Design a protein around this ligand. Structure first.
Ligand SMILES: CC(=O)N[C@H]1[C@H](OC[C@H]2O[C@@H](O)[C@H](O)[C@@H](O)[C@H]2O)O[C@H](CO)[C@@H](O)[C@@H]1O
Ligand SMILES: O=c1ccn([C@@H]2O[C@H](COP(=O)(O)OP(=O)(O)O)[C@@H](O)[C@H]2O)c(=O)[nH]1
Ligand SMILES: [Mn+2]
Length: 273
């Protein structure tokens, strides 16, 4: 007997001030966010959200960015009236990073907790500047971080699909999820764009003003060097997507930690095969 949440949330305040130069205390963030439940889960008390959103962050050795991520997103996500949870998908070991494989793990592991039907994929260091930028799913795949400060507040190219995006369960399944063999930096987001287009879809986006996004400036991570096979890889997505992705995924979860503001899944995703 709770009614549906309004279609657009009435709590939104639009543009917001964002800064990355003060310390963050997650204990304090937890106290400021008393309705977020153990594991970083929240649904609204007064109405039923149609948006069952798992937010999936690929992660290694970025604890500082993450505290800022949690400090800023958590209040935005409750204002958006989402039935959501946060998953940080922490790559075990010290071998070459694999952004997309981690995202696949996140989708698959999150589905074990709850009937999520929408998946937000968000890099850890991207903070939206306007709460009108909806962190949930549309009838087409949604690109969220459309106007990033580091790209001069516009898209670096019109097919860019990096940074932050959202796919319904069905859209994700329809493309066999993401590729597993993009190791080191670059290209996997293009592959994922290619995948959507070969399955008859197109990219939905908010306007550049609402989609304004801040990137936390940081220097290079070691163990995520530009993948030099990225350019061949994206040229063949149509064939490779058939048998690379969800339907060829394995991993070994080493540990699951329910922190107050997020679930962290530590996972062994291997090295190139
Ligand atoms: C394949 C790849 O590296 N994609 C990057 C992307 O690289 C910038 C890029 O612009 C494309 O349109 C050209 O096709 C390519 O050769 C490069 O000049 O940059 C974005 C954002 O940094 C990454 O998300 C992609 O992975
Ligand atoms: O060592 C790493 C490499 C990357 N990432 C995650 O993968 C994303 C993509 O990499 P990156 O920050 O390098 O993008 P860039 O801003 O350099 O273009 C990051 O935002 C993090 O979520 C991480 O947590 N640890
Ligand atoms: Mn970054």
């Amino acid at each position: 007997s709770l009614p549906a949440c309004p279609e657009e949330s009435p709590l939104l305040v639009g543009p917001m001030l964002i800064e990355f130069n003060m310390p963050v205390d997650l204990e304090l963030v937890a106290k400021q966010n008393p309705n977020v439940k153990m594991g970083g889960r929240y649904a609204p008390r007064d109405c039923v959200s149609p948006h069952k959103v798992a937010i999936i962050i690929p992660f290694r050795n970025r604890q500082e960015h993450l505290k800022y991520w949690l400090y800023y997103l958590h209040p935005v996500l409750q204002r958006q009236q989402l039935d959501y949870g946060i998953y940080v998908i922490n790559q075990a070991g010290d071998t070459i990073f694999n952004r997309a494989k981690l995202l696949n793990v996140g989708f698959q592991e999150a589905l074990k907790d709850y009937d999520y039907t929408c998946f937000v994929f968000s890099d850890v260091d991207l903070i939206p500047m306007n709460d009108h930028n909806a962190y949930r799913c549309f009838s087409q795949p949604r690109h969220i971080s459309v106007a990033m400060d580091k790209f001069g507040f516009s898209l670096p190219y019109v097919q860019y699909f990096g940074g932050v995006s959202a796919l319904s369960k069905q859209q994700f399944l329809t493309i066999n999820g993401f590729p597993n063999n993009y190791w080191g930096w670059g290209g996997e987001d293009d592959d994922i764009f290619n995948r959507l287009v070969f399955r008859g879809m197109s990219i939905s986006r908010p306007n550049a003003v609402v989609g304004t996004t801040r990137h936390i400036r940081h220097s290079r991570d070691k163990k995520n060097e530009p993948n030099p096979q990225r350019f061949d890889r994206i040229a063949h997505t149509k064939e490779t997507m058939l048998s690379d992705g969800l339907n060829s995924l394995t991993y070994q979860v080493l540990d699951v930690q329910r922190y107050p503001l997020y679930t962290q899944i530590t996972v062994d995703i291997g090295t190139p095969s």
